[PDB]
Every structure is written in structure tokens, then in C-alpha cells.
Write an enzyme that holds these catalytic residues in place. Structure first.
Site, PDB file in Angstrom:
ATOM      1  N   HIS A  54     -22.397 -14.704  38.197  1.00  0.00           N
ATOM      2  CA  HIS A  54     -21.147 -14.451  38.953  1.00  0.00           C
ATOM      3  C   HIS A  54     -20.069 -15.324  37.931  1.00  0.00           C
ATOM      4  O   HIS A  54     -20.642 -16.053  37.028  1.00  0.00           O
ATOM      5  CB  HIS A  54     -21.013 -15.210  40.212  1.00  0.00           C
ATOM      6  N   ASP A  77     -23.445  -8.224  45.303  1.00  0.00           N
ATOM      7  CA  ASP A  77     -23.529  -7.049  44.965  1.00  0.00           C
ATOM      8  C   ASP A  77     -25.026  -6.494  44.973  1.00  0.00           C
ATOM      9  O   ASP A  77     -25.369  -5.195  44.844  1.00  0.00           O
ATOM     10  CB  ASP A  77     -23.132  -6.788  43.262  1.00  0.00           C
TER      11      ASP A  77
END
Lengths: 350, 350, 350, 350, 350
Positions: free
Chosen positions: D235, D287
Site C-alpha cells: 500500500h 484488493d
């Protein structure tokens, strides 16, 4: 069923050991040089050459019926865009009977002949999201079809080449599609159902013939130097040469010389001159030159078979009219090759 | 209600014992010789002959409004194909008020006059599955209507004959349709509702008049030798001769001499010359020649009454405009011819 | 035309100097207490009270025909959203004849009665962009109409109040709409055209009556203290009291007491108690309480007149059936008040 | 533009060095355990937790507006079947303003929240040629959306998991889509245009995110023995762990244990346990688990991004409402890096 | 965000203290005198003046793509008639991506430029119930747009004035709409979504700008004697004079002198000559003359902003193409001004 003289027809004659093809006794060269598509269709269906007044009346009636109702166009608007043109052609031919099904023979013939190319072009235009182009009364059969397909008025030379191509592909002999047409017509049904059945039979595998695979091989070669470093050759009837093939090759050569050469023509010449030197029997057929002629005129690939159908409707109709008089249901016999005298078994015991 | 002077109108005058018909004091012959339909409609509605500038402005406004919206055409596409043209005309006249309902009188008049024939022709074309034909600005009223009906531009002689026929049928006198129009208009409602009510009244039995039954009898005779071996004659007002009938007969004779005789004209002449020798009082009326004139122009049989309505809209509108100023609800009285002072009976006791 | 006994009818009786209203000789109170809308319609049209089997068969036939074709709904989808409900009602009534035009009287009556409220509710739903709600076979006339209008099943008390209101407004006497209906029917035309003409006549000015102007005045007052610091009172026939007004007031009081008071009811009471003390002759009529009753049931303002039409169709139909037997075209006479014997003047000389 | 404090917002707080995510100061775990999607949306938009009456009124208003007009469905029927769901979502959001564009804030919020999933499901159904499924008033937000998508009522456990997933994806922080939404809203435009602009920004490359590429890699591995013999990890903000990722993983584990394991879950576990031993900073994000959770619920792959948008509408709307009060057009400055003071050159001289 | 050099662009230059406006370094006067709209758009998007062959190919490609599919027109037929033109423009721009989303830049540019005015004119025609007018290949950009809008071929002088107006309004500088376009494009999305977002941003309050309020004030004055007995003046950048304003005023004067003066022009002159004597800094801007020029050409008032958008598409597209190469997501930072570390409270405790 091959080899069984199941039909007695005086429409066409084919001699493969001599390269002879005749429509009602008239050689294909005579019609390809001094005849059009509509007069050849009249000769096929009615058995004799039309006079001046008959030819003009036939052309006027065909030109008057070239326009389809708005309900048919609305029906085409509901066709899926991913459907094949042959399925759409069959659906439209079947839908023609929802509306239009002594004078019955002539009216049906002229309506079918006038309207089949109109619906083919209409579906071609609708599939891409465009509006169908209306027919023009000033143009003739081939020129109007080309205008409807490409939105542009074609050169008279191109229209003549397309007309001669349609005459060549009007009819060859008894085959699967014609046999299905006669089987459907033996029940005294309307010609629209016969045309739909014949189109369904003609669709075949992959909804296409060997007219696009030749272009596939030509694109695979991709150059005039890769021909040396098979579909598009040979035939199952003729042994010397296809008499339609020579006319098709001459027309292709003339059209390409007038309208300028193209690279795919160059690869076609390179492959054919090499194939005629090491395989000649093996000779090219109409499936080789038809694709080139159609592509040069602006006809898409997946519409090759429908255009062939447009040529073949005159043949089918002829075979329909004949069959009529000889009313006899195709009722063949069968031999049983299964088990005998067994009984039903409970489902729980299976 | 016959015999009651319920209306005071200065629009038309009819004298049956003298064969006199006048629009606003001007004889029908003067208008039939030296006037058109639009100028006669202006005279009827507004009471005076228009000037040059007024006539040109009226014609320009009518020609500009001849085109209908695509929603109205879409509504006609939903009409059943088996419906009668009069029901469709009433539905379209009522639907015009869904859209277009000092300057209010003039705008409504021009919109109705411009659009009524357009919708009549549009329904005629749609009913058979064809697309409606758009109006052309180059043509005039009658010629544009004939082009829209038959897809072909009419001869100027035919257009003139149709215009004079429309002028003749523009208005006759008070009747059921006009009385219904005035009754509807007495409530100060929009002219579209008045036109719809008048059309509904004019539909009558079998959605038609005595204009097609004359053709039915003529076809029943079927020859010029079966006339000797009744609808189409007589009238309820005139006793000497219908003054419109002589003009209609002259127009029919001229149109048929210019455009060539037809067998049905021959049977009509044979029957009329025999009927004028043994029945003459009994004289032919406009219902005899109107059918022949309309059929020779290419107008279908079942569209005879709508065309009459197209002529009559100018009359109705005129009577509407008059009524307006004389605002008075038609509220007649009644006499009771039933039982008195009885009581409700339980259902179980019946 | 006021004062002329132009009709001989035994359907309804009205006495203004005694406050008497009778349907076929039966007082309105008896029907308002011990009758429904369908049985009252049967009494009006056929002249006698139906038996048990006849009533059940009538209700079954009406309930079976409450559903309209999808073509009619498609036609409503093409109506402009800004059109008035009366124009749409006239258009739908005229379109019913495109489809459905001894047993002919009964079938037409049941189809019209079943379908008119269905199309009214369908247009109400479509105008706002929602889908029409299909009728339910479990509900009865008024309850099904209320469900279709508001998507919610109504309370049985509300359905009963609406049914009694429909019975009260079923028919009053000869008037402009009924006179137009009889004039249209005198030509032996289909009842759908008669209904369309009657609706067009009933539309009147501004496509509405004095039922919404009462609410306009009530909102203008805006309080129970502004009544003291006229539409909705008086009548042209009755002099003592409208016999329908007392029943309507009782129904409104009962419905509002059961379903809770509303501020507009409070202003209505405040204005009516003041008007009954200084104007009493001047008395309130049905136009005062009908708006309140309809608004409390969830009926929109601009649909007041169509609902009235739904009540009035039974009356019109009755007058239609009578007229039939007495076949006589309304052909009144006129007196000419214009110029005589003038001639046409050239346009250039004007 | 990174690093510029261009906005002053009190809606959400993100701390990447501590793994803290708060909606209006309330940690994401509290809302994920003891809150639903609608109450979280109310908290985001209005800044405070709703009371009982406010929550019930909000839910009633949202449930009442879940149905779309038939014109919107007709518009979707004209969408091409090969179009991407994001383009259709943008088109439908823009079309909502054709219809529905103090009480203006609340009505727009409830209409958008009620209708966005309805149109998403309607396009999903229409694209495959099926009819859209109408919403049910008995179900709640997530359950009704799942029923509309899959025609089958979902298990309450699945509905709860989907609701918590929507709450997790409701809003994260300022980004490209939110910045575009605020830029559009700074001109005081309707929220429908803001939503359309935000959806267009969110579409991104290939009309999708990294939620389907994880499934692509998982299918490429194809076994639990090919993980050892990168999208879905890491991230750009958090360094310890995504606080939404732990909740998403727990929900996925619970849903898969209740509803039975699947092979793709097994490959996901095999790859994640190997990636957590050799790359741990590098940690899995939302995700990775969002795709698995959505696929187990029956959501198609290409509808992953639209569902995310369904979650994000509450965030965007919140940022819209804030922006409003702080009315200030985003009008940044620029520096010119081009040529100066040159003149136009004739075309023939080029 | 004002004052932050967030973009590095070499497309346009604006100097307010000197009245200088340059497209790619070329002054606006040179392009307004010796350039058209398409060549200016080519210069803006591609950065250099096109050659003869490039210009002809660009014009041919734009003229070939001016026709839209029948599905797009069908979608417009479903738009509500009361919707604003800006919402319809946004919906159509978003719908273009449902169909058409190295050679990708050029194809998208030509399709958008060819089709945006076509859909604007199509919605203008459909909204009033008329059929859209198809483009003509004989006309050029401005003339074809004017013909499509007004059904009549415009005078070449009017077409030239409209073309110069489009060139003037093609692009000014960075603003809210351009910033939103770049923010949307930073995610590497299709240009159709960028255009839709830019249109949504440009819609602004009341779906219009200050171009119609000037006409509102002019009609409020209502005479050339009420100017003496404010929108349309001043600017936020230029201090001496808007360099586009002088060209716009000259074009308006020339067009009005050629086509005859109008009363609103007279009131505009009266108000501007009084405002230039007591307020001069305060000077008129393009918002004053643009309304007059557009109204004299027959453009409706509510279509002023869409026409502006038609001019601005070239600018947006240019900024799109630039942004592309400089791929960088607009990801600004924020500062939190809310509460911290509070917990969820039960609903019953609120």
C-alpha cells in the site's frame, strides 16, 4: 444417397469429364457474355428466353418491390449485433412468409428476388449501428445492391462484373441445399419456407464456405516471397477445368487491371502460378477467384455466403416450380438396426 | 328536433325549391369557377374574401404546418391494421389536443387545416405497412395530399378537379355533424375536441356513407347491358336539381375525357341515362359522381368518408368560431314518461 | 334551445322545487343507502333491478374485462407528459373503437365500464413516469380503481364512500354532454365514438369544472380565522336543497370522523357555517363536498373531472341505448341572417 | 499537486504509521462491528449518529425510492450489450439529472443512494438479455441488491458480510475521484453531475482496478502447488497494516467457513502464507480479500468496480455537502513554458 | 487552491495587464483574421499549424464522422422533454463511450469534434417533438451546425461569423472545467469520460452562465429611453480590455449592419455607450456581445452554454493530450479539523 437418380430435371446439365455447364441447354459462356442476371433467372424459372415486353415487365415488377416494410426493418433492429448474417437471412426469409404468404407463382418469385438482397444489405447496415439505405429506382439489380451495401454508387464496370458473377453462381446442379428445397416443396408449402430451409442448409459449418479460408491462407502467406517457402484448388465433379473458373478469372483480371492491382491479388497470382506448375487433376475453382472479386467490390468477408445465396435463390425457386407439378412426397424407407421386444424398467431398478 | 330554428347563422344559405347554394351570400358556381379551397375556407371562417397579402400569408402558414411530430406518427404505428380510417381519424384529432391545446383562433385553424390530411394519408400508408410520405413545400394543398396518398405527383388538372371537389364539399348546411360540433363548442372547449366529436358523428353506420354503395351497385351490374335487365339518386332538400351535382358531373366528364374513359364510367353513364328517362322529382346527387371522381384520382374506397371530412373541417371550424361569440349552452328540457315514487326492493325478494 | 321538449326519456326525473331526484322512478336516497354502483348502472341502462344471477354475471363480466391490451398502454406511453387528463381520456376512448368496434349492446357496455377507469389510472401513472398497475380480481370496482390509482389497497369504508359517490354522480339529467351523446348516437354509430364525443363536451373550459376552484378559494383563505375577513354554492335547478348534497355531506363527515380531521376540512366547515347564516335561496351543492371527499381519498386535483366522467359513463350509455330504438337524426332548421345574391370579386380588385 | 493542503475536511482521518482509520472520529472497527451501511452513510454525510426515529425515516425514504422510472429502463435497453458497466453507470448517473435535477440536499441524497445499485443491477440483467428484477420492500439494502443481482434471496449472513464490506469501502480519504467530485461541486452544480464526474474519474485504465488482476494471478497459478514454483500486496499509505484488511480477512474466513471452502480460496491461502513469510513493509491489502468476498457472493468480475462505486457514493456525497458551504472555485495558476510573440504563417508557405 | 502553479502547460498564454491572449504563442487576432475553427483546433491539440494535406485529411475525417448511430438518436428519444440541454449533453457524451471506447488519440478527437454539435442539434430538435436533421457533406462545420439547428442553410457571412466566434471561445486558460478535465484524465481514462466530466463542471448554477442574464436585463430595460432611468461588464483577469471583446464587437457590428439592425441591438448600444462614459477598470466582456451574436444567428437562449461547450471541446481535448504524457494522479493532501478518538454510542442511548 449418392448415385440414386431421385430427380428428373431439365433445368441444368453438368459434364465433369468435358467441362460443360448448361442452363436449360444453353452454355454458361453464352449467358456470361450476352446475358444479365434477371434474364438468366427468367430463363431458369420459366424455361425460355423472355421477349422484350416480358423482360421489361419483369424488371419493372422487380424494381417496384425492392422496398421492404418498416415492420421488417423494426424486426431487424431487434436482431442481436453479434449474430451471424446467415441466421439473420434465415430469420428474414421466414418472416417474409408472415406477411406475403395462377398469379401466386409470379408474385412470390418477384417479391423474393427483389427483397432478399434488400434485407441482406439492411442487416449489414444495422449490425454496425447504421440506418439501412433505401433502394433507388434509377439503378439496376447489381448496382442497387452495391449502392445499398456501400452507400456509394458503383462504377458500371463493377456492376457488370458483379452481375456476371451472380449469373455464374445462379445455379450449378443438384446438391444438399437444392435437395432440401425440393423436400420442403414436396409438401406444397409456400416458397418462403422453401427459401428459409435452403438457406439453413446452405449455412453449413461455421456459417460459411471455403471462400474466406482462401483469404485466410493468402493473409497467412503475407508476401509474394512466402508462397513457396489445400483449400482453393480442386473439385469433386470436373476433371479438366471448371468452366465457370475461366470466366471468373478473366473477370477478376479485367476488374483488377481497370481498378488497379492490390497486394492480395499479387500473392494470389504468385501462389496460383506455383500451384499450376507442380500440382497439374488439381486446378483452381471458383472459390479462389470469387473471394478476390467480392473483396475488390467492397463486400465484407462474412457476407460472402449470403451473396452466394442471393445468386442461388433463382436456382432454388426454379427447382421449386418444377417440383410443384411433380407432386410427390419424399417418403423413403428405412431399415431397423436396433433391439426388439424389450420392456420398460422401473426407474428405481436402473 | 326537426323544424326548430335553434341557430341563427349567416354562413351558408340553401334553397331547395330553387336549387340555390351560397357561401356567405356568394353562389357556389362563382367559387367553383374562380376560387380555390383555401380561399373558400378563409371566406367561410372569417366572412370576407382575403386580400393578396392575407391569402399569401394564410397559404404560407398552412404550408409551414403540414408536417406532424414524430410522436403522432409513432402513435399511428401502434394503431391496429384492421381498424377503420374514421376511428383512426377521430383518435388522431383527439391526440392533436394532447399537444397543441386573439391568436388562438388563427393558430388552431391553420394547424387543423394543415395537419388533418397529413394524418389521413399517414394512416393510409401505415395501415398497409409502408412508411408515411412527408409533405413537399413545392406543391399546394390538393396536389400535396394526392402525392402523399399515392407517392406520385398528380397532374395539375387532377389537382384542380380535386380542389374544386373539396370546395363543393366544404359545407352544405346545418346537419347532425355540425349540430354536434356546435353543441361541443358551446362549452368553450378547444377546437380539437369539437373536430373529434364532429368526426365521430360523421362516421355514422358502417363507418361510411352512400358513396361506396353506388360503386357496389355499379359492380353488381357489371356491364353496360345489365343496367335495364335506389342509392345514388334523390335528395331530401332540393326538388329541381342539386346545384353541386351539375358541377361535379361536368368535372367528372372533363377529367375522364382528358384521362381516358373507364368501364365503370361507361356503366355509370348507362345507368344514369336510363334513370333520367323513367324516374324524372328523382335526380342524381353528389353521391353518384363523387365516388367516380375520387376513384379516378386513385383514392381508395374506404377513404371516401375521411376525404369528405377533410373538406368539412373548414365548415365545422366556421360554425365553431360563430358559436363562440354566441356563448349559450345547449340545455334543452325533457318530459318524463316513466313511473313515479316507487321504492327499492331487496335483491333476495326479486 | 332551452325550454324545447326535444327528448322523451323515462330514465331520470328531477324536481327542483321539491328536491326530488329519481333514477327510473327510484329515489336517490334508496340507491345511496342500499345499492352499489354496478347495480345502479344496470338499473339505469336496462330499466329494471337485476336479479342475483344477473348481478353476479354482470360483475364477473366486468371484472374479467378490466385488463387492457398492451397496445393501448404503448399508445399511452407516446402521450405527452404535459397533456391534460381529459384529452388523454378522449384519445383513449376513441382508440378503444380501433380495437373493439343482440350481444353488441351488452359487450360494449361491459367493456367500456370495465376499461374506462383502467385507462384513467394508467394515464395517471404513466404521466409521472411510473408503470401502470394491473387490476386485481379480488377487489371490486371502487377498491380496484383506488388501488390502481394509489398502489395501495384502500380501506373498505373508503371504498364504500367512493362507490356511493360514484352512484350519486352516475347521472343527473339532460345537459350538454348528454345532448351531444344523443346527437352522436342518432346516426347509429358505435358507443365508443359516443363516449368520446361526450367526454370532449364534458371537458369544457380549462379542461375542468368548479370542483377545483373551491379548493383554490379554500387555500386562498388559508385559515379558520380568514373566512369572514361564489363558486361552491347555489344551483340552477333546485331551490330548497340539492338532494345529493345532503348525502355527500353526510359521507364526507363520516369519512373524516373515521379517518381523522384535516385543516382544509376545518376551513370548509368554517366557511360553510358562515355562508349558511348570511346567504340562506343560496345553498352549497355537490361541487363543495365532492372535492373534499376526492382529496381525502388520495385523488389528485386535475383528475377530478375524469373521475366524474367515470361515474357518468353509465348515464351516457343508458341515453345511448334509449336513443337507438328511437332512431331519428337531430336535423334542426336554421334562419339565414346574411347577405343575398352577391358575386365573386377578383382578388386584384379587393 | 501532492503535498498541498488544498482542503480542510473533518470527515475522515487516516494515519498510515499507526494503522488508524476513523469516520468523523469514530474508528472503523466500531462501525464494522456495531453499525450498518445506511447508518454509517448518515454519520458521514450529516456528521452525527442518527437517532431511532431519524434512522427509521431514512431507511423508509431509501426503501421507497429504490424503484426507477420506466424511461430509465428503456434507456438502458438502448445501451450496447458490449459496453462496459462503468460507462453505463456514468450514463445512468448523468441521465438521473435529466429527471430529478433546504430539502434539496436530503432528497438528492436519498434518491442517489436508493437508485444507484438499482441501475447497476438493471444494466447487469439487461446486458445478458434478461429483464431487470424489481426491488422488494421486505429486504434491506444489501439483501435487496444481492436479490436483484442474482434473482435469489441471499442468506442473512451473506447480506451482513456484504453490508460490512460496503461500510469498509464507504470512504477512505482524499484521492483523484474525491478531488474531481469537489472540483465539480465547487461550481454549485447538482449532485448528479458530481456523481457522474466521480464515476468517470474512478473508471480509470481498462475500466477497472486491481481487484480482478488478483483473480487473474490466482487462476494463472491454478493450483496449491504452483504458488512457490506484485498486485494484491502493499500500500502507498499504511506501513504496519491496513486496518480494513484485517476485518476483510476475518469476514472472508467466516463466510467461507460457513458456506464451504472453494479451490480459489485454497490457492489464495497458499499464496498469502508464502508471501507473509518472505516479504514481510509488504502486506496484503483490501484488493486481495475484496475479490474473493465478492466472487463468493455471486458478483461477476467486471462488476467489482461498480460495486465499489456503490460503496463510495456516500463518501462523495459527504464531500459534496461540505464543499458547498465552503464555496470556492478551484482556480489554480499556471506557468507558461512555450514560445512567445510568433505570428501566423500562410498555409501555402508551410 | 488559487495561486498554486499546479500545471506546466505550453498551450495558451494570458496577460491581463497587457490584454494579450495567445494560442501556442500565436496572438488571437491572427487566428481570428486568417484562420478557421478546425485549423485552430489542430494547432491547439497538436501544437503546430497543419499543412495542406493534413488540413484536408482532418476536414475529410471530421466530415465523414458527423453522422451518429440510430441507437444514440433512439436514446435521445427517451430523454424527457423538460430536461436541460446541459444534462442531455453530459448524458450523450457519457453514452458515446458505450460505443466508441497510436491511432486512438486521433480517432477519438475526430469523433468527438464531429459528433458533439450533431447531438446538440439532435436534442434541440427532439425536445420540441421534431425529427433530427441529418448533416450535409457539402457544408462545413459552422454552416452544417447552423443548418442542423435551423433547418435552413445559413448565409456564408453568418457561417464565417459563427466560425470566428467558435475560434474565440475555443480556449482561454486554466479554469474549473479544464482542471476537472485534467483531474479526470490523470487516471488514464477515455476522453469521452473527460468530456462528460468537463461538461458537468461547466454546467454550473442554473445550468447556464452570464450570457442569458444580459438579455434578461436588456429585455427588462425594454427601450432605448430606459437605459439611464452589473452582469455583462468587467472581468477578473484583464484590466485594460478583453482582446476577444473587441473582435466580438466588430463581428457583431458587421453582422448586424449586413443583416439589418434589431431593437435589442439598439438597447445594447444605448446601455453600452452610457456604461462606457460613467464606469470606465470596468469594460464590457465577451458575455455581452456573445448573446447578441448567437441570438441574431437564430440560436435559442438555453442553448448558449452548449454552444460554448462545442467551442471548448477542442481546448479540453488539448489539455487531455498534454496531461497524458505527464502521467501524475492529482493526489493532494488534507488537514484534519475534527474530533479524535471517540467511540460508538448505542442507538437507544442517543
Amino acid at each position: 444417397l449418392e448415385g440414386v437418380p431421385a430427380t428428373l430435371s431439365s433445368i441444368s446439365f453438368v459434364d465433369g469429364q468435358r467441362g460443360v455447364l448448361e442452363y436449360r441447354g444453353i452454355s454458361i459462356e453464352q449467358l456470361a457474355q450476352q446475358s444479365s442476371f434477371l434474364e438468366t433467372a427468367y430463363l431458369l424459372i420459366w424455361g425460355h428466353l423472355p421477349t422484350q415486353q416480358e423482360l421489361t415487365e419483369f424488371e419493372h415488377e422487380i424494381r417496384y418491390h425492392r422496398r421492404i416494410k418498416f415492420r421488417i426493418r423494426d424486426m431487424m433492429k431487434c436482431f442481436p449485433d453479434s449474430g451471424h448474417p446467415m441466421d439473420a437471412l434465415q430469420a428474414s426469409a421466414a418472416a417474409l412468409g408472415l406477411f406475403y404468404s395462377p398469379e401466386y407463382i409470379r408474385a412470390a418469385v418477384v417479391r423474393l428476388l427483389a427483397k432478399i438482397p434488400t434485407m441482406v444489405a439492411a442487416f449489414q447496415l444495422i449490425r454496425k449501428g447504421n440506418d439501412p439505405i433505401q433502394p433507388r429506382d434509377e439503378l439496376d439489380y447489381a448496382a442497387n445492391f452495391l449502392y445499398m451495401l456501400t452507400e456509394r454508387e458503383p462504377d458500371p464496370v463493377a456492376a457488370r462484373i458483379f452481375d456476371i458473377c451472380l449469373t455464374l453462381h445462379a445455379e450449378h446442379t443438384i446438391n444438399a441445399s437444392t435437395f432440401s428445397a425440393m423436400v420442403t416443396a414436396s409438401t406444397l408449402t409456400d416458397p418462403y419456407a422453401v427459401v428459409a430451409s435452403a438457406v439453413g442448409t446452405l449455412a453449413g459449418p461455421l456459417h460459411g464456405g471455403a471462400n474466406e479460408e482462401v483469404l485466410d491462407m493468402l493473409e497467412a502467406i503475407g508476401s509474394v516471397e512466402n508462397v513457396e517457402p489445400i483449400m482453393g484448388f480442386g473439385h469433386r465433379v470436373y476433371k479438366v477445368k471448371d468452366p465457370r473458373a475461366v470466366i471468373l478469372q478473366n473477370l477478376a483480371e479485367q476488374l483488377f487491371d481497370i481498378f488497379g492491382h492490390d497486394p492480395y491479388y499479387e500473392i494470389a497470382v504468385a501462389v496460383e502460378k506455383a500451384a499450376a506448375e507442380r500440382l497439374s487433376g488439381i486446378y483452381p475453382n471458383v472459390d479462389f477467384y470469387s473471394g478476390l472479386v467480392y473483396r475488390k467490390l467492397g463486400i465484407p468477408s462474412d457476407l460472402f455466403t449470403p451473396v452466394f445465396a442471393i445468386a442461388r435463390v433463382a436456382g432454388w425457386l426454379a427447382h421449386w416450380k418444377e417440383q410443384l407439378n411433380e407432386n410427390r412426397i419424399f417418403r423413403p424407407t428405412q431399415i431397423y438396426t436396433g433391439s426388439h421386444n424389450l420392456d420398460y424398467t422401473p426407474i428405481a431398478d436402473r
